[PDB]
Amino acid sequence: MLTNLVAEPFAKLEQDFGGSIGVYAMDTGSGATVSYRAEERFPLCSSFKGFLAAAVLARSQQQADLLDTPIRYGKNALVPWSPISEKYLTTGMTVAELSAAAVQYSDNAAANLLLKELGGPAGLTAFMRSIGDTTFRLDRWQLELNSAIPGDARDTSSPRAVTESLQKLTLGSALAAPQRQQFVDWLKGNTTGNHRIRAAVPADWAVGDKTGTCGVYGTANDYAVVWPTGRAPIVLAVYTRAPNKDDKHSEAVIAAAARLALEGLGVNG
Ligand SMILES: *C(=O)[C@H]([C@@H](C)O)[C@H]1C[C@@H](SCCNC=N)C(C(=O)O)=N1
């Protein structure tokens, strides 16, 4: 009854893109939603790292010393796109610092170290199951998890489940209040999303997000919590893919889909 009260031209947008776009957006005040391909699976790519940091925070509720624990690593941990952890190879970083790097710079070495700590892909999947997400699956470590093969359900979720889980973790009760705010603060400090959902959000609204860019099959994504002033927050996810391995992703398409989602919710920007 409250889903897609106002139609938006998502189909034309994905046709111009040459692929598929999946969108879920939730107005947490009224419960109204915008939904387009929202229950289809799309590759997570690096966007799993946000949920990874939330899983670390959940663990820290029972292990008070976890976040400040210092983690040393060898040069063999430094895989492509490890922009923060490469600067601390000779010193180590704390679990909290690795989590922030994974979220805010999509740092691969940091994500791998944290995934190892949580028991690998199955451990992160188990955390998602524990908050009621039955759709998310992480199956591989990097870098193969980003292969984005058409029809492959490994390392995928749906826009809807991503949004529902993000809501639970940032606004709901899945994390204790201090950890919830820390997760929000990490998302707010993300540096990689300025041309995606944030590009559709007025500068005077708060917003946190996590991006993903698989590098193949036109596959890229972003999810975000947005706090418009004077009304309840909006949670949304925008995922893309495309049929050919060399199809390029588009940041502009993600921003445009986010704009349409906000318009469909009647959120004035
Ligand atoms: C995750 O999705 C990427 C991982 C596979 O390395 C990671 C890398 C950057 S984007 C890499 C190329 N940049 C632009 N096309 C990234 C991100 O910021 O989303 N995540």
Side-chain angles (χ1 to χ4, degrees), residues 17-103:
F17 169 62
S20 297
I21 299 165
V23 178
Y24 206 67
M26 172 193 305
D27 183 337
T28 68
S30 64
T33 57
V34 168
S35 179
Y36 186 82
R37 301 189 185 282
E39 298 88 18
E40 295 185 25
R41 287 182 173 285
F42 290 79
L44 289 160
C45 315
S46 294
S47 75
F48 82 90
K49 296 165 187 171
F51 295 117
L52 176 63
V56 170
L57 286 166
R59 182 168 289 185
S60 79
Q61 295 175 196
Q62 300 305 117
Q63 189 180 338
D65 67 351
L66 176 62
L67 289 185
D68 286 346
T69 291
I71 305 293
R72 311 187 37 241
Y73 45 93
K75 193 175 197 228
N76 66 336
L78 294 178
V79 297
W81 193 256
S82 294
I84 306 303
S85 57
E86 68 182 16
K87 307 307 180 188
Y88 298 85
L89 173 65
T90 53
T91 65
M93 303 170 53
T94 68
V95 167
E97 287 181 303
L98 292 170
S99 295
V103 173

Side-chain angles (χ1 to χ4, degrees), residues 249-264:
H249 77 280
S250 169
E251 301 205 280
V253 166
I254 294 174
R259 283 191 201 91
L260 291 182
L262 295 171
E263 288 172 359

Side-chain angles (χ1 to χ4, degrees), residues 125-141:
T125 300
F127 171 68
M128 297 299 282
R129 295 289 178 283
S130 81
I131 69 167
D133 186 328
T134 54
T135 306
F136 179 103
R137 56 187 291 182
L138 204 70
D139 295 88
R140 289 170 294 173
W141 315 82

